């Protein structure tokens, strides 16, 4: 009868508060549900128009941006890298030209520069356009502040990234407290870096994802880099979330004549976007029938980068037709998995003078997994279904 009564009394005050607030929360839930159901009736009717989900549903996972998240890294077999080693590597070789114009050009980084003698650290040191480089830009965010922990991993090795301090992430209108990703280098990757190392730049904002690279400053024929991504999201009580058809966006699945970006080995259900270059074929999600790099070339409708033409620059976060290189995966359960990578076209499709040339590519990729579904007008669930308050019983 000690803190039993004090607990009961605390829970009674909280009950009284929830009872007072419950009718307004129920009203707001009911109004939002009504809105969502009407938006879904229209999406069903429009399911074959350009940029619409072939199987429309509401987005329960609000997971667009987390600029203020906090990053923690652990690897049992890998090497977390000192910032100053990462900085030195950026200043030399193929990224030097951009580093001298105050730009961190992640896709030009020659990762051999990271393989120095006394490089290891026990905890994450963030690097990016921050501190003394607060006026610098990066090719991934331009002027926006981006930073990452750096790790060297070989085939089969993994890093576990924990992201806390999340300000805007919600599932079914409840706040997400923590996200844990385990990133593993897929053993079947074909990259040639003699050390066997891959650099993962793990951004502090988990919605920006990962920059994965084995680039040594030359292109490679018959190369690939794949990163397995296993993840669990956690609720306000630090418990794993059991997703029920949350939508995961797989965007920027670029296909050029020599290079395919693809997702594979995924949990959940692929949902095609109407009009998109992206489909599923043999458990792999990519541009299956056409290239998507340049209008007219290899069957592509649009041009991936902004050139001036109509619907060009499809490949960015804010472009209206970014769905052209996107798909969605409907996920459930508490533990989910997907593998993202880039591979030489000739390892995937028959050799062909337009669709699959032998020309070498850079074994790198920037990918992201988030809730920013690129299909048009997908409604978000922002209001929780309130649980009727239960009056507690006295000791
Ligand atoms: Mg891409």
Swiss-Prot record:
Highest taxon of the lineage: Bacteria
Subcellular location: Secreted, Cell wall
Keywords of the record: Cell wall, Peptidoglycan-anchor, Repeat, Secreted, Signal
Principal cellular location given in the protein's record: secreted
GO CC, one annotated term: extracellular region
Region feature Disordered, mapped onto this chain: 47-66
Region (V-region (lectin-like)): 14-385
Family per record: Belongs to the antigen I/II family.
Protein name: Probable cell-surface antigen I/II
The organism of origin for this protein: Streptococcus intermedius
Gene it is expressed from: pas
Full protein segment contained here: 284 to 678 of 1310
